Design a protein around this ligand. Structure first.
Ligand SMILES: *[C@@H]1O[C@H](CO)[C@@H](O[C@@H]2O[C@H](CO)[C@@H](O[C@@H]3O[C@H](CO)[C@@H](O)[C@H](O)[C@@H]3O)[C@H](O)[C@H]2NC(C)=O)[C@H](O)[C@H]1NC(C)=O
Length: 305
């Protein structure tokens, strides 16, 4: 049946227009469309990562209360996903920063995470994602923020959910051993840590180009991260990946997913970047019915569902 435990998609919109905080719904940001989500569920996708902004969720100070409108619109999406039996990944899409400044106190972060997790604590299908793509920060501080997220989450009473932790250097697979070897030390009472890495297939590994450097680069860029997972006895999920709608990229995505599936003892699954209702013309749009990656990649991806 399934090549992995999890295969699915990011659902973007709540994190758009981050230059506008709080911003206005329908103008600067939107929430994902549950009808399109249901289309992806019917196709067989069982995990959806949902980005949002920390500043819109808990304004002013991350130790404060939740914004009612933003939490309501967001958790409507989360509860739609889990109500259908799929996993919903709660993604603070904040790059380790809060109002632009790198986060530097584990207490405020932990209190943020208690406040947020308390709202989902009895939902076994929610997955908490500590922060999207830490980058250009002190590695020991990145580790400490992942640990503070774990601590705040479990202390909120949310002990049955998986926790996706993310590394420095944009949590890239192809650079994991270069930058995030120190991520081993993370501890969870529930023992439900999964190392979420991201991988794109263009020259700089950012994905801003819809060109892939070769038809085998996807496979090459995940070998070291795989052996790192095995050697240290860790689990991982490729929480973001994508490729341009051309043959070389399609073959690279195929080979990378074949390799990861061969090592499904440590690789728990994958999610495409990205779906959602405001991607019209995006090079990687998984949004049905007419997204480019939905038209060109769905038939490839559904092999692994
Ligand atoms: C949320 O997602 C739903 C489901 O995709 C959106 O509804 C759909 O909107 C599209 C575009 O307006 C409709 O597309 C058309 O379909 C017919 C063929 O059936 C085709 O002749 C046209 O060329 C075009 O492809 C689609 O039928 C429609 N589906 C349903 C069930 O209404 C909806 O607009 C989205 N709402 C948002 C973004 O908030």
């Amino acid at each position: 049946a399934s090549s992995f435990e999890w295969f699915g998609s990011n659902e973007s919109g709540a994190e758009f227009g981050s230059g506008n905080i709080p911003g206005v719904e329908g103008t600067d940001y939107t929430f994902p469309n549950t009808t399109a989500i249901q289309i992806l569920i019917d196709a067989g996708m069982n995990i959806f990562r949902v980005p949002f902004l920390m500043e819109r969720m808990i304004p002013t100070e991350m130790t404060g209360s939740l914004d009612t409108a933003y939490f309501e619109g967001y958790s409507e999406v989360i509860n739609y996903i889990t109500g259908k039996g799929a996993h919903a990944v709660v993604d603070p899409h904040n790059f380790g920063r809060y109002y632009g400044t790198p986060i530097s106190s584990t207490s405020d972060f932990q209190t943020f995470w208690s406040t947020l997790a308390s709202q989902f604590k009895s939902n076994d299908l929610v997955i908490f994602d500590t922060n999207n793509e830490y980058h250009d920060m002190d590695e020991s501080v990145v580790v400490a923020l992942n640990q503070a997220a774990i601590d705040g989450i479990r202390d909120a009473g949310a002990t049955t959910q998986y926790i996706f932790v993310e590394g420095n250097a944009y949590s890239g697979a192809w650079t994991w051993t270069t930058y995030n070897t120190a991520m081993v030390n993370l501890t969870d009472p529930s023992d439900l840590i999964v190392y979420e890495m991201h991988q794109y297939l263009d020259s700089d590994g950012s994905g801003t180009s819809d060109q892939c450097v070769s038809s085998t680069v996807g496979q090459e860029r995940v070998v070291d991260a795989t052996t790192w997972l095995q050697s240290n006895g860790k689990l991982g999920i490729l929480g973001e990946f994508a490729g341009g709608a051309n043959s070389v990229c399609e073959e690279a995505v195929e080979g990378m997913l074949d390799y990861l599936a061969e090592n499904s003892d440590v690789w728990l699954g994958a999610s495409w970047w990205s779906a959602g209702p405001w991607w019209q013309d995006y090079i990687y749009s998984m949004e049905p019915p007419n997204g480019i990656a939905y038209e060109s990649y769905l038939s490839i991806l559904e092999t692994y569902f």
